[PDB]
Amino acid sequence: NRLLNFLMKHVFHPKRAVFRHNLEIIKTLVECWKDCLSIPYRLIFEKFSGKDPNSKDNSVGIQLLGIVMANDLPPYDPQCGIQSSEYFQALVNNMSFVRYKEVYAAAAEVLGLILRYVMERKNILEESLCELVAKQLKQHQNTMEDK
DNA sequence: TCTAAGAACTCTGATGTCAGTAGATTACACT
Incomplete structure (x- = not known):
């Protein structure tokens, strides 16, 4: 847990x-080696959610959520002191930061795996997260046809 | 006994402007 x-x-x-290498330690440090995780999700929100139109520095929490997803999909936001009604909204909202590709598109790449998790685990949040995603993409559909 | 110098107005042509489009240039980056 401290590691x-x-x-x-x-x-x-x-x-x-170098950043790409540190990230690759995590990928095997979970999936090859621990059930014993208590995944540090209260950090992960801060590692992406801090809004600024020219942030690149949101991108690490996207990539990192992509590691805690790709290890055969542990659940997200169980009882970690944060509210699903705010947490997922930001994680979608990131895809408004259209100045840099790894900031906006990588959030969508993560979310297209989140639906595949929550729908196949048959949990209720896809009734809302699908609406969060759909609400935000409509803002592009009327204004930014390429993005 | 009248012939130009001074008006006046419109019109034409270039220069600079803004918004938006998209190309080529220039950085960034690979272990």
């Missing part, structure tokens, strides 16, 4: 090739 919270908190690097 994962540290490895994820300090994951960033100013050099893309």
Whole structure:
């Protein structure tokens, strides 16, 4: 638990090739080696949600949520002191930051795996998260046909 | 006994402007 919270908190690097390596430690550090996780999801929100139109620095929480997804899909936001009605909204809202590809599109790439999880685990949140996604993409449909 | 210098108005042509489009240039990056 102390390892994962540290490895994820300090994951960033100013050099893309190094940052990509720190991230790749996490991928095997979960999927090859721990059930014993208590995944640090209260961090993960802060690692993406801080709004600014020219942020690149939202992107790490996108990529990192993509690691905690891709390891055969543990659940998201169980009882971690944060509200699903705010948490997922930001995670969609990220795809408004159209200045940089890895900021906006990678959020959609994660969400297209989240639906595949929640729908196949038959949980109720796809009744809302599908509406969060649908509501935001409509804002592009009328204004930014390419994005 | 009248012939130009001074008006006046419209019109034409270039220069600069704004918004929007999209190309080519220039950085960024690979272990």
